[PDB]
């Protein structure tokens, strides 16, 4: 019992992009599927990158390269910018 989901965080992101817009539960199910699907894509590609280069650790370099391999063009650019900003903020703490 007590299964997990990203609903809380997807609603927190929605309240940022569109403070007055809500989301139906079916839409939130689609969004959970999207987040888990993309997580699996990134994590699988990063696992492959670590294996290819004979490494045991998946670091933020692996995630960056997986994002570059998987996302297209401007999505990859903005996602790399966001992840790098997040990691720089996290380490400065």
């Amino acid at each position: 019992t007590r299964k997990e989901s990203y609903s809380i965080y997807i609603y927190k992101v929605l309240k940022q992009v569109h403070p007055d817009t809500g989301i139906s539960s079916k839409a939130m199910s689609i969004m959970n599927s999207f987040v888990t699907d993309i997580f699996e894509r990134i994590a699988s590609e990063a696992s492959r990158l670590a294996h290819y280069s004979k490494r045991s650790t998946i670091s933020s370099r692996e995630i960056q390269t997986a994002v570059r391999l998987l996302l297209p063009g401007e999505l990859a650019k903005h996602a790399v910018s966001e992840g790098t900003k997040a990691v720089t903020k996290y380490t400065s703490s």
Binding site: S29, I30, N32, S33, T36, D37
Partner: protein, 84 residues
Amino acid sequence: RKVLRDNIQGITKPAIRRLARRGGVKRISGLIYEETRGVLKVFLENVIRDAVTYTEHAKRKTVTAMDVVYALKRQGRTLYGFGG
């Protein structure tokens, strides 16, 4: 209740026409309905075979939505809104 047979014909001509209209088809050959039924049956056979393989591995007797989602994803037909 008797065992099911010949249920492909329940995919009626008007239903196939609706699916064609959503696909943007203005005009349909009279032979498109049997072709469509065959294509649908092949697609369903392929997906349900994997869904039942997933069901059997889990030692279950009920086919769940996750088995279908896995069978589709296994075929490059990822589906959102039913789990995952």
